[PDB]
Design a protein around this nucleic acid. Structure first.
Ligand code: NA
Ligand code: NA
Ligand code: NA
Ligand code: NA
Length: 327
DNA sequence: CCGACAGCGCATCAGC
DNA sequence: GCTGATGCGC
DNA sequence: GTCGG
């Protein structure tokens, strides 16, 4: 629905969510507020009272009260107060830097480091990830047009195949469901040589090649199975340079690849439904495998999965195009 | 009433 | 030095 | 903060 419908309420709950996560370090309250904000964001009527809102799953007594105060006064005293709070607002803000979580943000503010400028001034107090996060603070908050995602995909698929044409790489996330923009790029990689029962350089060789053609520009973390870093499309020679983007690359055993593609394609709501449906059919589906459940609930050995559809077939679901997995 | 609310890789800390 | 915990991100 | 065993 139009954001003007209940935007004031959903904005309020999202702000409350952020303070719970970043300042109070109450992750479950953060999630409670987010869930309330989502269910309301989807509600196709302008809410007139807290009681009305309380009918929606995830909206309880306290949020109903807050909605009543917001409807009557156009604000919430508690939120107004924390907004103006120098320490709390700075803590909340610093967590926007990738690599600075609630613990680091609190420590920085405790010692008088409150702004990006302060961070810029205190490099030796930042770890590698945090320096990269500061360096690209603005770029990381920008979204990526699908057209750019397509150019990025072109490069990733090309270089992967160049390293070894037996690699399989899939760009997942909402991009794969056809979204018009992305927050970052999520690449799942496999190779027939690598199974759950079977090399510690399969990922490295790919990351290296992407660095050699100057696509990958920085590394946040790199192990044998997961890479997280930064990339940038080549500039059109005279055109303004593209923003640096977050890209993750994960190596997954071949026998677990398609479970991974399904999972990381989502959406999150689709995943919940498919997993439920799988249960009532006597299957357990997670990120890695689908397994049968015996009559007393004992999980059997993972079943053979050679495609996304193999998974749909097990639980008697008709195959669903990623474009159709909004829920 | 009171516990669940996901789980795991990687970088780094804390303890030995 | 080694192991396990913690912070962080997803 | 909300849900539910
Ligand atoms: Na409710
Ligand atoms: Na952060
Ligand atoms: Na953040
Ligand atoms: Na080849």
């Amino acid at each position: 629905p139009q954001e003007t419908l209940n935007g004031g309420i959903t904005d309020m709950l999202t702000e409350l969510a952020n303070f719970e996560k970043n300042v109070s370090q109450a992750i479950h309250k953060y999630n409670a507020y987010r869930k309330a904000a989502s269910v309301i964001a989807k509600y196709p009527h302008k809410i007139k009272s807290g009681a009305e809102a309380k009918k929606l799953p995830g909206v309880g007594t306290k949020i109903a009260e807050k909605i009543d105060e917001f409807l009557a006064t156009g604000k919430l005293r508690k939120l107004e107060k924390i907004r103006q709070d120098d320490t709390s607002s700075s803590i909340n803000f610093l967590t926007r830097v990738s690599g600075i979580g609630p613990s680091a943000a609190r420590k920085f503010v405790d010692e008088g480091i409150k702004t990006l400028e302060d961070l810029r001034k205190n490099e030796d107090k930042l770890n590698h990830h945090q320096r990269i996060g500061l360096k690209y603070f603005g770029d990381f908050e920008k979204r990526i047009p699908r057209e750019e995602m397509l150019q990025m995909q072109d490069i990733v698929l090309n270089e992967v195949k160049k390293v070894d044409s037996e690699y399989i790489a899939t760009v997942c996330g909402s991009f794969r469901r056809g979204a018009e923009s992305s927050g970052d790029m999520d690449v799942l990689l496999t190779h027939p040589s690598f199974t759950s029962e079977s090399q510690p350089k399969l990922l490295h060789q790919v990351v290296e090649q992407l660095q050699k053609v100057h696509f990958i520009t920085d590394t946040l973390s790199k192990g044998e199975t997961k890479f997280m870093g930064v990339c940038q499309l080549p500039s059109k020679n005279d055109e303004k340079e593209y923003p640096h983007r977050r890209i993750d690359i994960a190596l997954i055993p071949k026998d677990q690849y398609y479970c991974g593609v399904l999972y990381f394609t989502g959406s999150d709501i689709f995943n919940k439904n498919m997993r439920a449906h799988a249960l009532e059919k006597g299957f357990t589906i997670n990120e890695y495998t689908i397994r049968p459940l015996g009559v007393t609930g004992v999980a059997g050995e993972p079943l053979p999965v050679d495609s996304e559809k193999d998974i749909f077939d097990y639980i008697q679901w008709k195959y669903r195009e990623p474009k159709d997995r909004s829920e």
